[PDB]
Amino acid sequence: FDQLKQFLTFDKQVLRFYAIWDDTDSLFGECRHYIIHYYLMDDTVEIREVHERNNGRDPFPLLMNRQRMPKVLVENAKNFPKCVLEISDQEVLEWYTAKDFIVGKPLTILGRTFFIYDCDPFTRQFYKDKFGMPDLPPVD
């Protein structure tokens, strides 16, 4: 796989999803707004926190750093020493792809369930052109 070809074809192309993380079932849980970025150049995911005025949170712009996200780990990877080693392609059975991000579906990242409720106009056009999906209506 020509990593340079993927980079050159998809340079600065980012899919942007609007998501909620509903944690209200937790004792101090709040329903919170997040922006999910999927970078087409390297298949990496970044999760940004949306801060409202007077929300009482420390202004940290990121929930998750830009990294490649494992969808399914190999059964033996339960014993993988994550404290010393980064997860390689050998421990991951399936990586998150652009196909896995769908408006109106729950998305489970690192044990947090995000509900994707909308996507930007570029992402909407990209899904129409690449996957032949009909218009991705925003969920209220």
């Binding site: 980079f7 050159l8 340079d11 600065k12 980012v14 942007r16 970025h37 970078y39 970044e46 940004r48 712009p61 990121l62 930007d120 106009p121 570029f122």
Partner: protein, 438 residues
Amino acid sequence: MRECISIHVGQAGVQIGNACWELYCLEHGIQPDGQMPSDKTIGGGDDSFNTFFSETGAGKHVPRAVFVDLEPTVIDEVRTGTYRQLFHPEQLITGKEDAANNYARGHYTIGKEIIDLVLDRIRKLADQCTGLQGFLVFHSFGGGTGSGFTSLLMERLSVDYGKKSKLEFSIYPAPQVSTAVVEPYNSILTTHTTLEHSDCAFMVDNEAIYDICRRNLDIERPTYTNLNRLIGQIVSSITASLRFDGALNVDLTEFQTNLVPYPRIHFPLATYAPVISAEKAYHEQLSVAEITNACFEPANQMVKCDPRHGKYMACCLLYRGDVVPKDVNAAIATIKTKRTIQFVDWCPTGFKVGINYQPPTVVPGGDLAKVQRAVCMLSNTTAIAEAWARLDHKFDLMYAKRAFVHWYVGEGMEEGEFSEAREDMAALEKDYEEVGVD
């Protein structure tokens, strides 16, 4: 929230900054309108434009720069061009008359009028920055409003703000190619009075960039426009450790502790590694282990000077893009086994490294290719002493017949400081031969 003032005086520095400020708007999402795109996302975190741009609640993003020139015609083309709706209309300070290659027409006579409208923007600009860190001035030595007038800011900004590092980037006069007839005169005047207030004044040359663009870029019959986007990329790689993230972040507070050993040995010079056209940059492997060695050429230096006549004192290798830090470390140890790249005895360490996570950018309609990596070394060599040998000898022939003088003394300036500015630049030159004595 760490901030930087970017003053552009003279006629060169107002012209580099036309090509400098198009690059910061390009790295982030900001249109030349100043607004941010509705649909396209560039990927920017939340505050990475916080360093150079002051976001206002109206949606516009407003830059931190002051573009002052006494001769009006060069800021009036920025006041009409593509970047009109970017600036603050009070930033662009317009004069009335020339400075006309005269030091004393810009520093003393006409300079006494315009200076309070210059300073009353800087002392307003500081009061909105809550994390201010220093200055990024852009002028030129061989003129009359970038030479006389830079030391009229420098001997006041040092008085008010005290100890904050000030990093001015100046086009050094070239050996053979030269335009003004009087630039051996007004070069010495702006370094007798600004070496006492500078902290690190970097050097760029016109003759050296005219040759590395002839060969590496393989362009020919070049312009001034094709030079400004090579000086716009150095300063956007200096100021990438304030807007991005990475392994080693070298920010602006320690450029005086990394690069300045003794308090008057602060004249370092910079290069940039992967300058290849779009037909040859895909035909070889450009990795970490050789773009750190293409930095150490004689023919890749932005200043026309042989590095091989003097030993280095302190480097700084500011990497960028896709670099893992093992590849730097085996590559610096390649350098010190070579008996040509001569380091010197009181500094065993010498090298200082920063890494980052954002690749180089390319301007649309550019001359440069798309590369993953970028290295911008900054070296404090002792070879620049004989770049000051010639320009004292240029002074020593024209003063030897009192030539060209009376345009200076007429416009409020004593003759008594010609003899003591060249008394001074002996005492600057006597230091570089003193420090090299092991």
